[PDB]
Amino acid sequence: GDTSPAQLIAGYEAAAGAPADAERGRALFLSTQTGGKPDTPSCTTCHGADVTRAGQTRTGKEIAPLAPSATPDRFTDSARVEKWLGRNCNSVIGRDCTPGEKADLLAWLAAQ
Ligand code: HEC
Numbered sequence: 257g258d259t260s261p262a263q264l265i266a267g268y269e270a271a272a273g274a275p276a277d278a279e280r281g282r283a284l285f286l287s288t289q290t291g292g293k294p295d296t297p298s299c300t301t302c303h304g305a306d307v308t309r310a311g312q313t314r315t316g317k318e319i320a321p322l323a324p325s326a327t328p329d330r331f332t333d334s335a336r337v338e339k340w341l342g343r344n345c346n347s348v349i350g351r352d353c354t355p356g357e358k359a360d361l362l363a364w365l366a367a368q
């Protein structure tokens with residue numbers, strides 16, 4: 257792609273002013289939120305709790321696994337991460353994810 261996962265995470269860490277924390281990323285990803293859309297209370301609603309397995313849309317269509325260990329080119333395009341997170345941070349949390357949240361989430365996801 258046009259970037260590496262490390263370059264993406266570094267960019268978010270610089271915007272947040274702090275290093276990524278993958279344990280915080282894991283906790284946010286598995287969390288149940290109440291501020292966003294009713295049908296999507298968690299990132300796991302579509303991607304599952306184990307990101308090495310396929311996820312499912314809200315209609316049951318298969319979503320390729322988010323883990324780079326199962327799907328190779330994950331997190332190698334800066335616009336694609338922004339485009340999807342720009343949509344589903346709002347759907348799950350009710351607001352855009354901050355750059356620190358994006359750093360933490362990708363740091364956890366990139367190691368799976
Ligand atoms: C269903 C409505 C979703 C919810 C809720 C969340 N995500 Fe998602 N995500 C969804 C799709 C259909 C896709 C694209 C399909 C694909 O195979 O990529 C994505 C994509 C992402 C990405 C980008 C991956 C890349 O290749 O760079 C990321 C980083 C991601 N999803 C993470 C993520 C998080 C952190 C969520 C909660 C805030 C979340 N997703 C919610 C579908 C859905």
Ligand SMILES: [C-]#N
Nearest residue numbers: 340341344345
């Ligand atoms: C997904 N975003």
